[PDB]
Symmetry: C4
Subunit: 387 residues, 4 copies
Amino acid sequence: TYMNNTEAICDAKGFAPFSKDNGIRIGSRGHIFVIREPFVSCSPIECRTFFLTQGSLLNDKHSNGTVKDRSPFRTLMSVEVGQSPNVYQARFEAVAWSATACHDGKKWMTVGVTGPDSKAVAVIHYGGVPTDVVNSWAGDILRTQESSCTCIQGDCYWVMTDGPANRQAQYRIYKANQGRIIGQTDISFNGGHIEECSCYPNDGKVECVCRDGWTGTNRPVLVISPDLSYRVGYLCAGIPSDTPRGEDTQFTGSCTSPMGNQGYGVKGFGFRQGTDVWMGRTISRTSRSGFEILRIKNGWTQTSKEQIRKQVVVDNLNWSGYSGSFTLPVELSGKDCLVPCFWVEMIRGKPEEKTIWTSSSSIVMCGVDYEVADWSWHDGAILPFDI
Amino acid sequence: TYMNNTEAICDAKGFAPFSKDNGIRIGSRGHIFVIREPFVSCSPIECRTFFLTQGSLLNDKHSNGTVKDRSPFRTLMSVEVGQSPNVYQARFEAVAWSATACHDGKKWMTVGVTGPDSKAVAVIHYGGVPTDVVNSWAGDILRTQESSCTCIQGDCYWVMTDGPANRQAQYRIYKANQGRIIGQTDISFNGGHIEECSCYPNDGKVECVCRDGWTGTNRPVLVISPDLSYRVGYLCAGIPSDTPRGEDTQFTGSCTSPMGNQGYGVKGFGFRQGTDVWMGRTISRTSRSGFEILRIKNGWTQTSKEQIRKQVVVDNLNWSGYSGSFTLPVELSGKDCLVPCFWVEMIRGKPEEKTIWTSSSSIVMCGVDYEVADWSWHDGAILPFDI
Amino acid sequence: TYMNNTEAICDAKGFAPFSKDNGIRIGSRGHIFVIREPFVSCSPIECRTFFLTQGSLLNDKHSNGTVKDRSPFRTLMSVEVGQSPNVYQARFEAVAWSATACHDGKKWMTVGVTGPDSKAVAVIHYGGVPTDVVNSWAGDILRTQESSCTCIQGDCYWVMTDGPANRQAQYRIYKANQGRIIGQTDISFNGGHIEECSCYPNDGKVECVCRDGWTGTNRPVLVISPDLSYRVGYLCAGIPSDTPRGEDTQFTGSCTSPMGNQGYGVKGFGFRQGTDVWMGRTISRTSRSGFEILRIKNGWTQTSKEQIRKQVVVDNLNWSGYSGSFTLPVELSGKDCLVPCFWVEMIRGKPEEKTIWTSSSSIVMCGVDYEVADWSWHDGAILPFDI
Amino acid sequence: TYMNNTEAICDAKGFAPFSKDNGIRIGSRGHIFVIREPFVSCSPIECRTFFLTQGSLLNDKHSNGTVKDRSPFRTLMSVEVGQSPNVYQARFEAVAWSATACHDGKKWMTVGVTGPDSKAVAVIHYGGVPTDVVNSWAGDILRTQESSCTCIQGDCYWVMTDGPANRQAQYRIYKANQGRIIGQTDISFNGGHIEECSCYPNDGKVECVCRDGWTGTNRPVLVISPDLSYRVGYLCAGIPSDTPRGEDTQFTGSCTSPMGNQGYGVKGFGFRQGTDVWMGRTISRTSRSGFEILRIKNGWTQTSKEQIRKQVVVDNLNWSGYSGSFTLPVELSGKDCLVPCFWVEMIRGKPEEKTIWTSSSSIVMCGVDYEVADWSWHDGAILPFDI
Ligand SMILES: CCC(CC)O[C@@H]1C=C(C(=O)O)C[C@H](N)[C@H]1NC(C)=O
Ligand SMILES: CCC(CC)O[C@@H]1C=C(C(=O)O)C[C@H](N)[C@H]1NC(C)=O
Ligand SMILES: CCC(CC)O[C@@H]1C=C(C(=O)O)C[C@H](N)[C@H]1NC(C)=O
Ligand SMILES: CCC(CC)O[C@@H]1C=C(C(=O)O)C[C@H](N)[C@H]1NC(C)=O
């Protein structure tokens, strides 16, 4: 049957380590897929780690990295959370250089985008077989979440962006049941920018915290009602969570507009806790080095700067990277609310390091009604490799 | 229970990428089977990729290739579509240097041919265990489809050829239920030649588009009625789909006879769409380099040359090869018709390249009621290998 | 539920190739267990290949072979028939340097013998967990079948030998239900010798064809009635099936006594067909090179020399070795009789070859009501290896 | 449903070999996890071997060992008992540098401790997903069993230690149902020390035999009643079972207090048999070389020195190490009592050997109502490795 997922996000005080694949270290001798963007999504039986592969393995000439991101070899695959992205325990999902996946309770729905930048194609899989298609609607790198989509009472939702990485772009919300598209919307957000949204269900609505690659240091936020009606803006909090960014000390939070002249960005997440908010962010304000998560009182609905909790998961002397959100199905947690969990990707090799390749590990963290001590669960690999 | 498969083929405007194994690239460091003819067949649960192995792995001395095609090491194995043909996720099907497989809805039926050329033997497996046998009936390399067979309401059908590769040969249609042969027919086709048929179910009849290795540039076609009564000939279309071939400009299509003095050939497919037809063909008219698929209006029943659609899946600067047909079970697609899908094998290494070995990758494409942009999902491997 | 297995063996005219692992070739680059005695047994779902491992992999220093047969590293493991004995698809059965296994229809029962030669211990596993034990009863290398045991209507039977390899030894028949021993017998056979029996069910009785390592060129035979009452002797046929052996031309068959002063031997099998008999034997009369199977008219009950069929499975220019018997569960074959199948082990490396290691491949053959052409499905590996 | 486990431990006369992974030997060429503390726990379907990994593989630079025990890469994983801890058949359990696991009959409950020594965190997983948390309660390396926990009628119990390795420390007993903590107790044991307890169910109470790292040569023992009421002390027997230790000849057993000025220790086990007791211990009184198990008459409740049985499982010329206890579910054994089983870890490489790495194999032994001959099932690896 279908996963209801109409409950509220559980109010957590800190997060506990779920898993850690240690893919890259293992990849020194094992046959591990040189991967990227290892997001986590769960079914009512297990949580899997999805990732993008370049058809090559670590420590192999084919990992040269000079291969473009959106190459024709890029495929989406997965493994049970915590398992390294190894060739022998991997499952083929879809052909993609940008994807998203979620389980509605019965079958798995993946969405892989592939094809030319000017006319990319997004194929929707369901049950391990393509069911529907979304063609580029603006001829400029059709892309999506890079993290779990959301299914509430059978219908699954996800957000896509078609347009430039700098200036305006066009965003849309797709809705689908059993692999087939049943509706969609255009998101009006002039002056605003949306990319790689980290969504989760909360009170029968799809809450996402995204990335502003145009002019946003604070992250855009968009609550999606089951009828595709929606609400867009930014995380109110008077504290910048995007990377790069300026000091918090110079940031006046804003609920409706981007702030900081910074233009670039990085994929992050955020979890609303009533009116408060758990926001994640690299420790470095410039490099993708370090990962932490702060709880800002009333920060979901106020330019609050009132930090009530802080917990580091990757110290600032270690490489961080992408990070996404997802929820534990109630059928696995046993709680009456949806436990909030996230993952931190850990990029190793180029550009910051001197190796011909580039990949990343990850650690998964979950809700918990306790306060968890700071620590660093970094990659640990030893570069350079045999090459 | 049994898969009905009595529905009509879905009318598609283009095809979307299903999967891509990237076996050869992976095989640079992984333990991938040096394989060939990686056809796809689906059960009411999953689609698997079948392939032939020479008992050797890529980057190993045993891949020397000097080993004959029809050697005693040739075994048929499989993996879930999209997965590389690796040793650790592979399943043993049957001993064969020519095979076919299909799922009737309950168990898997494979057919592997092995043995001496002059007295080869075809063993029918069902449930992962031999049930019946077909001995060479003409003493000249007994062979079969190299792609999915067809099961309609419990009974599965497939076509075999026993005789020379040039001149006439003898062809037959076998029918079987639960692994045991329940009937057969001889196909009268004097002047005509049949090899490696790509079949699919359509309106309770088995439609196949085959290969003419004698004198055919256009491909032979044979509709098989459930009672082994049948119809044979050629794809009508005024456009040559076999390789090698001459220009379309010099080809007068023919519904009943082969045309073009070309004698060799390559395994291809074709899908009837009402009266129209989706035909596949290497882009090069001589080399097995490039892959495309054209929709010819009324081309299934008329010497039509009226092209209504074209979509390249492997540009002409990349190696192509074999290609077959299959259908998505309605139990996976959800549609009320049978979605048409195919696979393109991508040969690397000898003969066109300077390496001691020879193998191939593949990409799977499926129906879809949308128009998909041209692109190239080629192998990508970097030859030569460590050797 | 339990597998009845009370039916008669199917009358076959020849055998068809079931599978071939190609382990050793694959083992050149893959991670394949350096193994030995790869017997096959089937459950009402699948047939698996059991084998003995020395805890080492091919192409690794640990394969040095100088390690004794009955070493403490010897463990019994398995894989689905046709799959190589690779580390990643293997299942742990029991600790053993001599074993046997059979499925009663519900769970798997394995029997592994390990320990010191003078006080070896045989542990009976059932459901993947030890249930009972048989201690050496004569203080001289307690050993067993090296091939499938037999289960009829829930109770499983197998034969063991405790004593010297030359002179007399003591033999016994054990019977067990759900992993626990429910009875046993001593086999009186003075002047006779029994080792590595190849058993199969036939008409509610357990028929075995064994090995005479004392003075037998013809093979001992022992029909076991469900009540442990039994019958022992030799294959009547006027043709020697053990290896080494003398010419058939100098062999006067004998139903009750061994013949030929040859003392050594090799594990073989035989299938009764009414009164006839299918006997297997290496082609060489001295080396374990080559494998063939002859059908002798009335040879099961008469000193017959009347050969009605011959089919080679491994030519005489290729290494052979052990060979065992088993039957296809009726739940897999679908027949009303028990299809007779066997396996031929193919030894490579020392002693006949110049490599530091020793292992073997195998091909599985099954019943079939047709006549199958002669051919050779030999190992194919290329020695020596990287070492 | 839930596993009752309210039965008494079966009275065994000796133990029989269950399995042996041969991980390290295999690891010479295979992709085996450099592991440690490979304890065994069983579900009502299978017994699995749990182990700790350092995110590295054998024969890889990452196995340098210089990495601290309680590093952030330490994760808990598992495989079906007897299988080596290889990357391709492993399952991710929890992030930990100290763990425990048990199956209540429905789902698996694992407990992994990770984090800083001064504020470590123990995450309880259930169903393959974190459910509850235990924070360090004394700020000094929060740790646990390193062997199977215990579930009786749905509720699972385990013991933890927070405090110094020498002097006093604080111990507690946790109880949990379906992954969530439902109660706990502080163990009063002044002058006494408790670490790495080997527990098992016996007569509806949890019996554990632990380690005294302070001043104990005899092992502490603690019977836990379902209501967290309990009983603590030491194995009465007038024979020392901890390592290092002095001679038995100088040991006056003690039921309530530690004896021998030895301070260090090693993880061992013990099984009560009525009033008797099966105690395990390294053969060497100083090195972790050798493994044996003695049955002391009345030794569970008397300073008895009356040895009734002895059986060596690893001779004294071979490296031994940790050892734990567990029980065969009645649903696997079929008995009316709980069969007692244990595992012996076999440490290879540093410190006793000259290699840059450190790991261990293991052999599993079980109850049995027979007397099993002495023998040595040691690791067998050949050090040093390629490195
Ligand atoms: C096209 C812009 C888009 C959003 C910033 O770029 C992403 C940034 C990335 C990055 O900043 O590391 C990696 C993603 N693979 C890429 N997405 C695609 C489809 O190429
Ligand atoms: C015997 C002629 C037959 C049809 C042309 O040859 C095929 C052509 C092939 C090819 O053109 O690449 C490869 C197939 N492995 C082969 N089939 C067999 C059984 O050897
Ligand atoms: C002890 C004699 C016995 C029967 C001849 O030897 C077998 C012969 C063998 C052989 O001839 O190759 C290999 C078997 N591994 C061995 N069995 C044991 C237990 O060592
Ligand atoms: C903190 C003391 C504790 C009990 C003696 O140490 C153990 C001894 C060990 C040992 O003696 O080999 C290895 C264990 N990995 C270690 N536990 C932790 C958590 O580090």
